[PDB]
């Protein structure tokens, strides 16, 4: 009903004004050292990390660029994310080789240098947005000089895609868990979202181009030729490889002693199936293209999404299962609710069933009934199918708020269309 | 017998050093305008075209810069060299939208602004080149910023290889005979030749990588999946395209009306193949890799050539014929006489089948009493089967010296390692 849309986007505003940016504004600025403090434990307080990713200082950008073109944030967010790069260009940028580096400490200094293309994405992504946001040139500027140097030593010119692990003088990576063999969905799906905002920012004919092939790629590479969810890691041949831990990581490992099949490897995520697609329908807006160009993909990974991956008794998300059906790991993570709002949404907008608008509202309460802690405005990061915590961190050095806050946006705009049509 | 290779590899170094390296030395330099002068008649006078095209201005680069690593020129081709890469760059290079451009006239002018990725190539090989024979880094320079151009703009991150053609601004040209949605045999295999060299010059990881992935798009694309022969032109997806002319040409347009079936598309050219071939096997050499690497694609190229190519009773490899060994047209063009005389000396090393080098002296002579003017210095273009000449211009904004001085330099070489072994 519109009743119900407009109580949903009304929870969603309150909650973005009043709880989830001021837990950000309140902490992360860091004026002694530059770029932003991000390591927050239950109670909100420093749990003292002595680190500043690449992935928390451009997500930090990112975050506070778009929320800023939205509209939120008071006005205060343009210079946070200003802030934000000139930590970026000033401590993380490799002024002899290039490219943004993979890690620094507390205070501005460089402690990994190697060039790791999931980190640079996200450099893409975000400073792409900062331009759009802010006029500043210098977001495109290294944006642009970033997606240069991907072309010249990433991209493998024979069988497509990219080499995704390199050393700080952009020499490959070695074979395995050094990750210069592998092709991954992580950064094939992330540059698609990169090259969006890149294109969004430019204009120009070469971004246009690229966003499409890496589109491509991922429909008729990653994707499973007949499911159509999200294959995670191929040899360079875009053969099928093992799934393996690399060096470098850029999030927690989970292992649920519950979890079914825990060696099979036809597992797939509904989040980022989920997370694809609506990318994906994003892309297709910012090119000018319908989204039936890509029907048969779009309505693949959202009916797989809502027939296995949704907890109805429950409520939320589950983590991952089979490429066929199966649900493997019933437990609740955040980032995988955040990407199922807006994607439920866009699922109902383009395939029109009313299956993905209560998928939305069961992922919605289960979002601010149970994940939510609203004492202090920031997501658990991962709890039992029913709703309790398993970890209790708010914030750490790759859980920022990318996905909560674009979710918050992403969703109130889209019940807004929902409303309208 | 040894005898016998003596006299081969004197007769070229006479030719070489009195005959058709003068032809050039008091022809070319144009001190008033800079670049070359390339168009010479059937009596080695001006024909007067208004033209310096990229092909011939980098080529001319080529040519110096090798046969001056080589010993040959009596010292002088070195600052040949040097003025024309002064031309390349104060007179062809772009300095708002980087790459060198197509076509000049003689005053120095821009009259094609393309950015054509064939011309593109031989500016890497011939820069690349002229480091390593005199030391000054512009030639690197600019054939490293080629290079980085190449990988943003040309390379399609989906399929894989090359798009061809582009307006001054790097936008990708039309369809068709525009140039913009095809992907060529003469493109990809003079990249090779480019890489390899830039690899030489640099000894970097990436010019490593993208060579061993230019051979496998060959190898694996664009060479006959049975017969090894090379197809010409391809969609961006690596199917086989119709065979079309350009608006953008570095050729004459023969026809020869004894040809046979001359609406087929089976067709492959002897001297494309064993150009290939031998370049493949100077790309391992570089890469210190064996031949046998790519024994079955090496094997395949030179067989067919032999086998098909070579005319036993008048001298000299035909133009063209099909993949399953049919031959098409038996006229005598200069620049395949030229790669099969390097061609069929690296078979007879590779392979030692004494065939190839009864083709070899089959090919020497030939060129040595059929196709040298040996009043002026220079080649004939274009011959009867039987050696009579057909055109007679000496040299034009496509006819250079970038064959036959490489094959005579190339060809004394192998010879000697042949006597040696």
Redesign the interface.
């Known amino acids: 009903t519109s009743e119900k849309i407009a109580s949903l986007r009304q929870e969603i505003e309150t909650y973005l004004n009043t709880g989830l940016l001021p837990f950000w504004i309140t902490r992360t600025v860091d004026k002694e050292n530059g770029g932003f403090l991000t390591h927050f434990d239950q109670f909100g307080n420093d749990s003292g990390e002595d680190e500043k990713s690449l992935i928390a200082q451009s997500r930090s950008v990112f975050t506070y660029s778009s929320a800023h073109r939205a509209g939120y944030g008071g006005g205060v967010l343009a210079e946070m994310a200003r802030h934000g790069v000139d930590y970026l260009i000033n401590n993380m940028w490799d002024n002899e080789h290039g490219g943004f580096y993979w890690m620094t400490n507390r205070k501005g200094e460089v402690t990994i240098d190697q060039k790791i293309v999931y980190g640079l994405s996200f450099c893409i992504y975000s400073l792409s947005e900062y331009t759009l946001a802010t006029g500043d040139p210098r977001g495109r500027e290294y944006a642009e000089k970033t ?2 140097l991907l ?3 990433a ?8 080499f995704e692990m390199f050393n700080r003088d ?3 990576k070695g074979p395995g868990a050094a990750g210069g063999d592998r092709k991954t969905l992580d950064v094939h799906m992330h540059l698609m979202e990169a090259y969006t905002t890149l294109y969004e920012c430019t204009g120009q ?2 971004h246009r ?2 966003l499409l ?2 589109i ?2 991922l429909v ?1 590479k990653v994707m499973h030729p007949e499911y159509g969810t999200g294959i995670p890691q191929f040899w360079a041949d875009w053969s099928v490889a093992p799934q393996i831990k690399f060096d470098i990581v850029w999030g927690w490992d989970r292992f649920n002693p519950d979890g079914l099949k825990s060696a099979a490897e036809d597992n797939t995520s509904y989040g980022h199936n989920s997370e694809f697609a609506w990318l994906l329908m994003h892309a297709l807006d910012i090119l000018g293209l319908p989204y039936d160009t890509y029907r048969e993909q779009i309505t693949k990974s959202y009916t797989h999404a809502v027939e296995n991956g949704v907890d109805w008794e429950f409520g939320g998300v589950y983590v991952e299962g089979s490429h066929a059906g199966q649900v493997y790991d019933k437990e609740k993570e955040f980032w995988q609710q955040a990407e199922m709002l807006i994607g439920m949404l866009d699922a109902y907008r383009f395939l029109k069933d009313e299956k993905y608008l209560q998928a939305y509202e069961n992922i919605h309460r289960f979002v601010f009934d149970k994940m939510i802690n609203h004492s202090l405005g920031e997501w658990w990061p991962l709890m039992t199918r029913e709703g309790v915590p398993i970890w209790k961190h708010m914030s750490h050095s790759w859980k920022i708020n990318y996905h909560d806050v674009r979710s918050m946006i992403q969703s109130i705009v889209r019940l807004d269309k929902i409303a309208k049509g």
Do not use: A, P, S
């Open positions: 997606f240069d072309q010249k030593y991209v493998d010119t024979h069988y497509g895609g990219y952009w020499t490959l004919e070469i181009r690229k092939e890496t491509e790629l008729n």
